[PDB]
């Protein structure tokens, strides 16, 4: 494996870098999606709370 | 002179378990992505819940 | 350390699992090494039977090996009369040492010029003051020999070898009339004497 092993190492380590980048982008995407969905849940329940306060008024 | 047979043995074994452990590490990062997703949605917006509930 | 023998290409580059050990093998069992380097260790680089350079005791050669393979290869090659060495390529280890060698030699010569000038000069004045203190002695001993008055006449001399004793006895004959009694003359000669030799 004088040279062939080096090439296969290069390819496999490129694939490992690619999956690490994929996982990192997955973390960032899920962080953004979590923030967005949790916010939207917050405002829709704000709407229902405001309706309850309208009824109480 | 172990030659191409042992070259293929070393290549297939090493790259195989590299790709395997690579995949499980990525999937574990995805599992922790699920964990931080749920924790954020139940903690940060939940402190927001407490603030707004006190406000109301 | 291998200055003009080993270089970068010999050792493994960007190594993830391997380490290149410069396992020197003599020609007495070189075919042995290239044939059973697999027996020496499992999980080894195929076609790693590479020889770098030559020397009078043996032939330098290197083996690329996983970590456990390095342990096993060392373990079963120390008994195989192979020199073990986990050298790390370092151009600085060569360039530094050679630079200090040449610079220190040149500066040592440039400062040794002053050494010889200073040394020969200072020794010449040292010998000048040397003969001066010797003359001061000659004066003191000649004076006290003849009492207060400082009237005396000094002289260099150079006796012939093997004619020394004849000169001793004729000068004893000459100077024994000054005192006319005893000047067992030995060290304190009937003349005020001092000795010097180069």
UniProtKB/Swiss-Prot annotation, chain A:
<comment type="function">
    <text>Subunit of the V1 complex of vacuolar(H+)-ATPase (V-ATPase), a multisubunit enzyme composed of a peripheral complex (V1) that hydrolyzes ATP and a membrane integral complex (V0) that translocates protons. V-ATPase is responsible for acidifying and maintaining the pH of intracellular compartments and in some cell types, is targeted to the plasma membrane, where it is responsible for acidifying the extracellular environment.</text>
</comment>
<feature type="compositionally biased region" description="Basic and acidic residues">
    <location>
        <begin position="33"/>
        <end position="53"/>
    </location>
</feature>
<comment type="subunit">
    <text>V-ATPase is a heteromultimeric enzyme made up of two complexes: the ATP-hydrolytic V1 complex and the proton translocation V0 complex. The V1 complex consists of three catalytic AB heterodimers that form a heterohexamer, three peripheral stalks each consisting of EG heterodimers, one central rotor including subunits D and F, and the regulatory subunits C and H. The proton translocation complex V0 consists of the proton transport subunit a, a ring of proteolipid subunits c9c'', rotary subunit d, subunits e and f, and the accessory subunits ATP6AP1/Ac45 and ATP6AP2/PRR.</text>
</comment>
<protein>
    <recommendedName>
        <fullName>V-type proton ATPase subunit G 2</fullName>
    </recommendedName>
</protein>
<comment type="similarity">
    <text>Belongs to the V-ATPase G subunit family.</text>
</comment>
Curated annotation (Swiss-Prot), chain B:
<feature type="modified residue" description="N-acetylalanine">
    <location>
        <position position="1"/>
    </location>
</feature>
<protein>
    <recommendedName>
        <fullName>V-type proton ATPase subunit E 1</fullName>
    </recommendedName>
</protein>
<feature type="modified residue" description="Phosphotyrosine">
    <location>
        <position position="55"/>
    </location>
</feature>
<comment type="similarity">
    <text>Belongs to the V-ATPase E subunit family.</text>
</comment>
<comment type="subunit">
    <text>V-ATPase is a heteromultimeric enzyme made up of two complexes: the ATP-hydrolytic V1 complex and the proton translocation V0 complex. The V1 complex consists of three catalytic AB heterodimers that form a heterohexamer, three peripheral stalks each consisting of EG heterodimers, one central rotor including subunits D and F, and the regulatory subunits C and H. The proton translocation complex V0 consists of the proton transport subunit a, a ring of proteolipid subunits c9c'', rotary subunit d, subunits e and f, and the accessory subunits ATP6AP1/Ac45 and ATP6AP2/PRR.</text>
</comment>
<comment type="function">
    <text>Subunit of the V1 complex of vacuolar(H+)-ATPase (V-ATPase), a multisubunit enzyme composed of a peripheral complex (V1) that hydrolyzes ATP and a membrane integral complex (V0) that translocates protons. V-ATPase is responsible for acidifying and maintaining the pH of intracellular compartments and in some cell types, is targeted to the plasma membrane, where it is responsible for acidifying the extracellular environment.</text>
</comment>
UniProtKB/Swiss-Prot annotation, chain C:
<dbReference type="GO" id="GO:0045177">
    <property type="term" value="C:apical part of cell"/>
</dbReference>
<keyword id="KW-0375">Hydrogen ion transport</keyword>
<dbReference type="GO" id="GO:0030665">
    <property type="term" value="C:clathrin-coated vesicle membrane"/>
</dbReference>
<comment type="subunit">
    <text>V-ATPase is a heteromultimeric enzyme made up of two complexes: the ATP-hydrolytic V1 complex and the proton translocation V0 complex. The V1 complex consists of three catalytic AB heterodimers that form a heterohexamer, three peripheral stalks each consisting of EG heterodimers, one central rotor including subunits D and F, and the regulatory subunits C and H. The proton translocation complex V0 consists of the proton transport subunit a, a ring of proteolipid subunits c9c'', rotary subunit d, subunits e and f, and the accessory subunits ATP6AP1/Ac45 and ATP6AP2/PRR.</text>
</comment>
<keyword id="KW-0770">Synapse</keyword>
<dbReference type="GO" id="GO:0005886">
    <property type="term" value="C:plasma membrane"/>
</dbReference>
<dbReference type="GO" id="GO:0046961">
    <property type="term" value="F:proton-transporting ATPase activity, rotational mechanism"/>
</dbReference>
<protein>
    <recommendedName>
        <fullName>V-type proton ATPase subunit C 1</fullName>
    </recommendedName>
</protein>
<dbReference type="GO" id="GO:0033180">
    <property type="term" value="C:proton-transporting V-type ATPase, V1 domain"/>
</dbReference>
<dbReference type="GO" id="GO:0097401">
    <property type="term" value="P:synaptic vesicle lumen acidification"/>
</dbReference>
<comment type="function">
    <text>Subunit of the V1 complex of vacuolar(H+)-ATPase (V-ATPase), a multisubunit enzyme composed of a peripheral complex (V1) that hydrolyzes ATP and a membrane integral complex (V0) that translocates protons. V-ATPase is responsible for acidifying and maintaining the pH of intracellular compartments and in some cell types, is targeted to the plasma membrane, where it is responsible for acidifying the extracellular environment. Subunit C is necessary for the assembly of the catalytic sector of the enzyme and is likely to have a specific function in its catalytic activity.</text>
</comment>
<keyword id="KW-0813">Transport</keyword>
<dbReference type="GO" id="GO:1904949">
    <property type="term" value="C:ATPase complex"/>
</dbReference>
<comment type="similarity">
    <text>Belongs to the V-ATPase C subunit family.</text>
</comment>
<dbReference type="GO" id="GO:0098850">
    <property type="term" value="C:extrinsic component of synaptic vesicle membrane"/>
</dbReference>
